[PDB]
């Protein structure tokens, strides 16, 4: 399989040519969207990459072409660990498809965040806020593949199943690739010594929901999260080998491209995934 990477929360992690140039990864998911919803202007947040405002950071579409061109999967991610984003209603959801698609995807808008390049796809990475809605979000984007080109649909619940957020969501099989996060929650991530939790987790996840392949999702750094992170050589010995078994394992996912350079994780672990 592959490593998805989360790209776009420390304005010292390169840019995304940069980045995509690596040749570790797959898939870049952009982080974040992190206001939309509730009638609020969506607002991208790239932290100290660009300011969005009067075009700043258009420049990131050269970034999205030269991934794509070496066949890299480039996602728009919505949400985070900080935001007031939510849905307050079904016509919410309608609003908030129609923008993407007009600002990010096929469709036509003066004022694209990130230019002109057209996004493979949106990441949904739910953390808090409503529950509802999320299923209609990505019935109304799946729509708009029927145009001609795919909308790919991404998401990053938490290793608790069934995820709270966006349970009903991935219960309507319209997503490609789930990345599942094995970490900030003791129950299904990785403690010293002990490998079961996370792939009693693991076997949870690959056995009940429909999408076409699932990822390992795992924090590259120690300070990349508040717990569950995992040495690479444990990685490697005891649970890739247990969880590469599943038909459906896609790869591992990393937050994030800062923490990795740092860390060398993605470096260490590359041809064992």
């Given amino acids: 399989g592959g490593i ?3 790209w776009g929360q420390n304005g010292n992690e390169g840019t995304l040519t940069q980045t995509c140039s690596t040749r ?13 919803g509730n009638g609020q202007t969506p607002q991208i947040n790239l932290a100290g990459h660009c300011n969005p405002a009067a075009g700043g950071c258009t420049i ?31 016509a919410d959801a309608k ?6 698609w007009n600002n990010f995807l096929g469709g036509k808008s003066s004022s694209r965040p990130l230019g002109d390049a057209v996004l493979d796809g ?55 690739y789930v990345w599942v996060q094995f970490y900030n929650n003791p129950p299904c991530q990785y403690s010293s010594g002990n490998i079961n ?18 990822f390992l999702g795992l924090p590259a750094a120690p300070e990349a999260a508040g717990s569950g992170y995992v040495p690479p050589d444990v990685l490697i010995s005891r649970i890739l080998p247990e969880i590469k078994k599943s038909p459906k394992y896609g790869g591992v996912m990393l937050w994030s491209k800062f923490y990795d ?3 060398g994780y993605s470096s260490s672990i590359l041809d064992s995934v």
């Fill in 4 to 6: 998805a990477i989360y």
């Fill in 24 to 36: 570790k990864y797959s898939y870049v998911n952009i982080a974040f969207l992190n206001k939309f």
């Fill in 60 to 90: 990131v579409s050269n970034g999205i072409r030269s991934c794509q061109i070496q066949g890299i999967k480039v996602m728009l991610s919505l949400g985070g660990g900080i935001g007031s984003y939510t849905l307050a209603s079904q």
């Fill in 95 to 100: 609003n908030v498809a129609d923008y993407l």
């Fill in 122 to 176: 949106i990441d949904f990475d739910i953390e808090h806020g409503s529950t509802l809605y999320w299923d209609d979000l990505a019935r109304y984007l799946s729509a708009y593949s029927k145009q001609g080109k795919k909308v790919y649909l991404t998401a990053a619940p938490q290793c608790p199943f069934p995820d709270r957020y966006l349970g009903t969501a991935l219960n309507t099989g319209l997503f490609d």
């Fill in 197 to 214: 939790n996370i792939i009693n987790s693991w076997n949870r996840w690959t056995t009940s929901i429909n999408a076409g392949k699932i």
């Fill in 261 to 263: 350079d740092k860390n």
